[PDB]
């Protein structure tokens, strides 16, 4: 079927770590993390518990830093139970500590990306214009 295998899909299915050509277990989940906390901020941008307060761009950050932590355990703690130790012979995702480092994208990755995404939203740059009420001139 075209959706399963086509011209663009044949490469894109084979372009993210566990299918990507020659990607190290350090970057084992770059996208798998760069795409997490960035879209987890969406539902917390205009809908959260703290959507109508002064920290509209804070609850989402902390909730993402917690949910990524949950999805990291649900990744590594299982990885160890599907494969023992050392590495494998085919793919570096299916590897033991390789899967323990599959979190290296959740970790560091999201903790910095979801951080900067709202570090740009809480602020608004210092540039404005203010009237004058002195008369002393």
């Amino acid at each position: 079927t075209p959706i399963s295998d086509s011209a663009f899909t044949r490469t894109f299915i084979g372009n993210l770590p566990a299918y990507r050509k020659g990607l190290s277990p350090i970057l084992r989940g770059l996208e798998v993390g760069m795409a997490h906390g960035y879209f987890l901020i969406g539902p917390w941008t205009l809908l959260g518990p703290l959507r109508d307060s002064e920290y509209q761009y804070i609850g989402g950050l902390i909730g993402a830093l917690a949910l990524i932590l949950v999805a990291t355990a649900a990744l590594s703690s299982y990885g160890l139970v599907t494969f023992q130790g050392e590495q494998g012979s085919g793919d570096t995702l299916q590897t033991a500590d390789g899967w323990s480092q599959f979190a290296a994208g959740f970790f560091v990755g999201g903790m910095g990306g979801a951080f900067v995404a709202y570090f740009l939203l809480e602020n608004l740059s210092v540039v404005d214009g203010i009237f004058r009420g002195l008369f002393n001139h």
Binding site: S77, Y78, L80, V81, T82, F83, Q84
Partner: protein
């Protein structure tokens, strides 16, 4: 006012703790016992 009882800084830690302690360890224990596996 939340804590009309003595030592109001305990119930806080106690509720989160049980929150991220007992079922976390419980779900992890079954996992760990699934880990031994057996490749033959």
């Amino acid at each position: 006012m939340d804590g009309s009882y003595a030592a109001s800084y305990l119930p806080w830690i106690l509720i989160p703790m049980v929150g991220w302690l007992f079922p976390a360890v419980t779900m992890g224990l079954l996992f760990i016992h699934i880990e031994s596996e057996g490749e033959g």
